[PDB]
Amino acid sequence: HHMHEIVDKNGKKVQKNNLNDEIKIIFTALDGTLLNSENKVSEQNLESLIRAQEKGIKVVIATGRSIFSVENVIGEHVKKNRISLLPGIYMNGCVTFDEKGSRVIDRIMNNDLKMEIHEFSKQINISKYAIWFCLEKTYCFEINDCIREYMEVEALNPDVIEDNMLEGLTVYKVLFSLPENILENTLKLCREKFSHRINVANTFQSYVELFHQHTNKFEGVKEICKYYNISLNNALAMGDGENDIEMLSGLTHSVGVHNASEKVKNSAAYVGPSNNEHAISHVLKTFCDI
């Protein structure tokens, strides 16, 4: 079967003996990549992460999430020091921590641009689907089935606040949890309105995220590699969604998981197993010889 293989653009399996770069560090998306469809770390992945720690391979989360929601999803592994959150790349790079919890990237959204996005979202009536991200907290203006769906997956509940409170908040991103039926059209409106203003990414499903135009996960990758004096050629990135494209195309070694879209796969050097098939375990086997 093809379930567990990693292959190049020609469809040929990647062989360790043909690799000339040691992989010292792995950057991975969380939902859709490391976590299976139940948002759990499979036992096969966990076993391989334990071996990677024994061998001194660093595994770094790179996610649209805040560190707070990451801790709520994978906390049991963090508590056992099986997955480290520091260093880590959060809010699509706009908050990137070194191992001391210091932000080596802090990209706040300009406040005028924040209010312009806010006003536009009210004008097209997606404001009710907005989750606004501050450094330590998230906010929404109401609760509906789409906010509910967001909360259940995110596993961290935003505070409900009034409209006029947004002006006083210092924010990094906004995430719209959209109805499927309006996703495609809303994505077009946001991208047309905000090009060369802000990043617009459909990260998973009907979620649309807006965050600092000049920042992305790859900016975090560069900062963390720099920290440890690791050449980019010794780093590997793996991912599934649009917010992974820059880090997949920015590194020579990168793995799109099988469940990723063609656009995401195209940006990656290699295609691996799906997130339900223990992708990082097989990445560790292929690149690091387990």
Ligand SMILES: O=P(O)(O)OC[C@H]1O[C@H](O)[C@H](O)[C@@H](O)[C@@H]1O
């Ligand atoms: O960037 P990732 O770690 O793949 O996260 C992907 C994200 O997709 C959406 O934003 C979901 O609401 C989040 O729960 C999920 O974390």
Ligand SMILES: [Mg+2]
């Ligand atoms: Mg993902």
